[PDB]
Design a protein around this ligand. Structure first.
Ligand SMILES: C[N+](C)(C)CCO
Ligand SMILES: C[N+](C)(C)CCO
Ligand SMILES: C[N+](C)(C)CCO
Ligand SMILES: C[N+](C)(C)CCO
Ligand SMILES: C[N+](C)(C)CCO
Ligand SMILES: C[N+](C)(C)CCO
Ligand SMILES: C[N+](C)(C)CCO
Length: 300
């Protein structure tokens, strides 16, 4: 693509000069790809740059008009010689930090960070999103942090850990980035991630039992829960109860199918029972005149 010029050392930097003009941005020179930024300085190592190939940031020299278009940006790695790493699969590289990113030929060595595995797309840019590796799903960040002036792209392409949203469904990656599935206890509470990994919220039927995960935060509930102007009792295991349930000495009746707590007179196998407005089963007394025995049965 670019020819007739020659690399030059000057002012502690490396430039590519052709006819007294410093190349800028993306250039392909004799089988290798380089990036010279907005004024010519040759880059090395980790770089967050506008994507190449369009023409708006390619084959340009400081003696030319630069289109105001603001192109998408992604991470790229350049060798210490400024040559782009044309990887389409994976590479072990040092964790992107503030010290080892955006540097240029002529600057001192960064500061060791820690080696990590980075995956790449078919155009040599760091890959983002979900990936399945060695039997597990990992989420490679697609977004950076904050906005405009204080925007931070460092997180992009990194393996996510802990609670993470996918832009929104929530997921939880373990200490090594592994996405959890099914029942998992996190911070002492239970969560159900099903088989796809997305966090369940609200009511969920799992293995023949009903459970209620916080409609917002997803954490499994237990004990008495007032849901939808109805009471339900969830065992310590979280599983919903149906039928008779004794809390202390007080009895309650959870609807045989839906599970909601009953109040008022109700029948169970022909026999009549009465529950107060709190659910407490009436026993050995009279209810509006009708006698109820020790089992709460309406006797004559
Ligand atoms: C793990 N994935 C999120 C990619 C699968 C469910 O869509
Ligand atoms: C991040 N979540 C709200 C999904 C977890 C509850 O702490
Ligand atoms: C069955 N759960 C996974 C909900 C917890 C009981 O230990
Ligand atoms: C457990 N159920 C989902 C059936 C009751 C709430 O509608
Ligand atoms: C006769 N009882 C009122 C006790 C039964 C509900 O119909
Ligand atoms: C036992 N309950 C929580 C259902 C009654 C309080 O009114
Ligand atoms: C189970 N009951 C609530 C019906 C009474 C004890 O037999």
């Amino acid at each position: 693509n670019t020819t007739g010029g020659r690399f030059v050392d000057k002012d502690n930097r490396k430039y590519y000069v052709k006819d007294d003009h410093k190349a800028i941005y993306w250039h392909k020179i004799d089988g290798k790809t380089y990036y010279f930024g907005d004024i010519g300085e040759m880059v090395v190592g980790w770089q967050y740059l506008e994507i190449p190939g369009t023409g708006y940031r390619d084959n340009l020299f400081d003696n030319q008009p630069v289109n105001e278009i603001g192109l998408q940006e992604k991470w790229y790695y350049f060798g210490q010689d400024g040559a782009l790493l044309e990887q389409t699969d994976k590479q072990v590289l040092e964790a992107k930090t503030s010290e080892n990113t955006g540097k240029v030929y002529g600057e001192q060595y960064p500061l060791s960070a820690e080696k990590r595995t980075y995956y790449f797309d078919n155009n040599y840019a760091v890959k983002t999103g979900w990936i399945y590796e060695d039997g597990n799903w990992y989420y490679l960040n697609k977004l950076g942090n904050f906005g405009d002036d204080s925007y931070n792209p460092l997180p992009i392409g990194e393996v996510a850990k802990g609670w993470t949203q996918d832009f929104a469904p929530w997921y939880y990656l373990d200490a090594s980035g592994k996405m959890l599935t099914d029942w998992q206890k996190v911070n002492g509470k239970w969560y159900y991630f099903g088989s796809s990994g997305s966090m369940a919220t609200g009511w969920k039927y799992v293995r023949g039992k009903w459970y209620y995960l916080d409609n917002k935060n997803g954490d499994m509930k237990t004990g008495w829960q007032y849901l939808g102007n109805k009471w339900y009792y969830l065992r310590s295991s979280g599983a919903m109860v149906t039928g008779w349930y004794q809390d202390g000495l007080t009895w309650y009746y959870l609807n045989a199918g839906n599970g909601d707590m009953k109040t008022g007179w109700f029948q169970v196998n022909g026999k009549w029972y009465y529950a107060y407005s709190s659910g407490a089963l009436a026993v050995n007394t009279t209810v509006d005149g009708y006698s109820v025995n020790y089992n709460g049965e309406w006797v004559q």
